[PDB]
Amino acid sequence: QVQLVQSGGGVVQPGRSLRLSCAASGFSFTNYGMHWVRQAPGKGLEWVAVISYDDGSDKYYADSVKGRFTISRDNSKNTLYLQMNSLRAEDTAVYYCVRDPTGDYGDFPEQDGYYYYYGMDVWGQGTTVTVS
């Protein structure tokens, strides 16, 4: 019953901040890296950020959100966070939470000692964020 459930959608003011949540269930959340991916209205997918496995040592952001957004994870709560600051009209998008396979292609996850992009296999159903 692998499941990702997102929450935190709504309108906000430019220059303000806003957080997002996606709670994992049905798998060992600690052992997989996680992605945040958005899709602006009528546009294509844009990768936002990634968090490393179990400890989040390595954590990488795109230049569209660098210096304003922050990713974090609570392994005890099996839940992933997105710290969004300084929101702008260009950030208006539907935001997706995605698990990185981190090796599990049907066998088991791996531990590379750094972040490695294995893909994007389990997706949330998305939540909507509008800046106006």
């Binding site: 791996e110 590379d112 750094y114 490695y116």
Partner: peptide, 9 residues
């Protein structure tokens, strides 16, 4: 003592 894989290194 630590360890890294060869995939991206």
């Amino acid at each position: 003592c630590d360890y890294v894989s060869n995939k991206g290194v």
